[PDB]
């Protein structure tokens, strides 16, 4: 049971500070070099910094994007690694993980080679640097620009805009309508706010036979909205 | 915006083989030794290749790596459905901080069903929203397989990058994929163009929808 467990992540205002901790277990923690890495949603992994082992001097290295603002320290006696993040920017928002440097050693005919790699990875802790705070959605009807009549099917829906945090729940006609309902994952905007859409497909020929009302529920802000969509 | 460049997506059927390229500079891949990782959802990355072409114990010879110049390649042969995962290259930087550096990742699909083109629906801004002094065009992409697309927006047939936000692709409850792209403009910008298009490219083929402010 070798493992790394990070904690301390949360919502922080730009210009704020936050301290993450990573706890190691199942291996001689003092023997290894450790890294902080981070990954923004829809982005690639990015190395934040390292701290070497006491025998290798215990010094730190930082990415140019965080140097001067972030400080890494370890406590060997508590199998603990820390990351103190100051002057946080919206762009520091990410899942932050701790990793060890491991190695594979190849015993050569004369001499030993050491190939290093990020070996043990923690599951990560989410840091959100945003000015956003609990906000219920604005809800708008989605109807075609072109009169969607004659022929096959029609799509109609509800745009559920600008809410924080997740989740939002959308049903149609109080849950009576389920056939042809498709609620999409939310997009995160640069404000820190989410938006999602829910669409319903119906026969075009059928269009004035009944009503369509989306029932939007935002538990974090204790907001509910019912909105009829007319085509 | 990833130090090392990989393709976002690759796919082939069981039994087949695939390569995944990773492009860098002299300062990472050129000078140093490349690593490859496999990651499953929710799971720690597993080392697949180190030292450009060496496999850890337990990694079968179906996986192979090579490097030349400033690029590196990972090959997988005799594809198994168990190989469906994300693959990313890693090396380090030769600069003063010797950062570890990573590819953006490649999602490999092992084809279990026929390719499906995306259904695309494009909605204009609503009358209500325009009165709220805002305008969002909404492009909804569903039912495609394999799970990767690229989305381009046009206004009066010319490219629009500004005000665009697209989600990552997501697994639908039926094993196909869905994505969403939002173009945000001012009401006055909205009314200024003759048409707007959401163009979704899937497996070399593009599905496009258009709206024109003049209908509404």
């Amino acid at each position: 049971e070798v493992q790394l467990v990070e904690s301390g992540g949360g919502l922080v205002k730009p210009g704020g500070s936050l301290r993450l901790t990573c706890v190691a277990s199942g291996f001689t923690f003092s023997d290894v070099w450790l890294n902080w890495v981070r990954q923004a949603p829809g982005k690639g992994l990015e190395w934040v910094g390292r701290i070497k082992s006491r025998t290798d001097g215990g010094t730190t290295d930082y990415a140019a994007s965080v140097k001067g603002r972030f400080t890494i320290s370890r406590d060997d006696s508590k199998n603990t690694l820390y990351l103190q993040m100051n002057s946080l920017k919206t762009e520091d928002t990410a899942v932050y993980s701790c990793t060890t440097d491991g190695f594979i050693m190849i015993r050569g005919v004369s001499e030993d080679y050491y190939y290093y790699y990020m070996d043990v990875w923690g599951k990560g802790t989410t840091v959100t640097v945003s000015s956003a705070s609990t906000k219920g959605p604005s809800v708008f009807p989605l109807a075609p620009c072109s009169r969607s009549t004659s022929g096959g099917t029609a799509a109609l829906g509800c745009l559920v805009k600008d809410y924080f945090p997740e989740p939002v729940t959308v049903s149609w006609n109080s849950g009576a309508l389920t056939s042809g309902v498709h609620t999409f994952p939310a997009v995160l905007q640069s404000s820190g706010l989410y938006s999602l859409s829910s669409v319903v497909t119906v026969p075009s020929s059928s269009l004035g036979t009944q009503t369509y009302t989306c029932n939007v529920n935002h538990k974090p802000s204790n907001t509910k909205v019912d909105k009829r969509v007319e085509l | 915006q990833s130090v090392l460049t990989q393709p976002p997506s690759v796919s082939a059927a069981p039994g087949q083989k695939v390569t995944i390229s990773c492009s860098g500079s002299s300062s990472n891949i050129g000078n140093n030794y490349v690593l490859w990782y496999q990651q499953f959802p929710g799971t720690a990355p597993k080392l697949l290749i180190y030292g450009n072409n060496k496999r850890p114990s337990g990694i079968p010879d179906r996986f192979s790596g090579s490097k030349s110049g400033t690029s590196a390649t990972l090959g997988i042969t005799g594809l198994q459905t168990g190989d469906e995962a994300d693959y990313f290259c890693a090396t380090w930087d030769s600069g003063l901080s010797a950062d570890w550096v990573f590819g953006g990742g490649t999602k490999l699909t092992v084809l279990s069903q026929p390719k499906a083109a995306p259904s695309v629906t494009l909605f204009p801004p609503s009358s209500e929203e325009l009165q709220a002094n805002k305008a969002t065009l909404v492009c909804l992409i569903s039912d495609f397989y394999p799970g990767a697309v690229t989305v381009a927006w046009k206004a009066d047939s010319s490219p629009v990058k500004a005000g665009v936000e697209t989600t990552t692709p997501s697994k639908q409850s039926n094993n196909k994929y869905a994505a969403s792209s939002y173009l945000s403009l001012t009401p006055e910008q909205w009314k200024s163009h003759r048409s707007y298009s959401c163009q979704v490219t899937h497996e070399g083929s593009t599905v496009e929808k258009t709206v024109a402010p003049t209908e509404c």
Binding site: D101, S110, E111, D112, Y113, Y114, Y115, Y116, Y117 | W92
Partner: peptide, 13 residues
């Protein structure tokens, strides 16, 4: 003799 291949590593040992 030990060769070290990683970032920040003293190649020789």
């Amino acid at each position: 003799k030990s060769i070290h291949l990683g970032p920040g590593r003293a190649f020789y040992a």
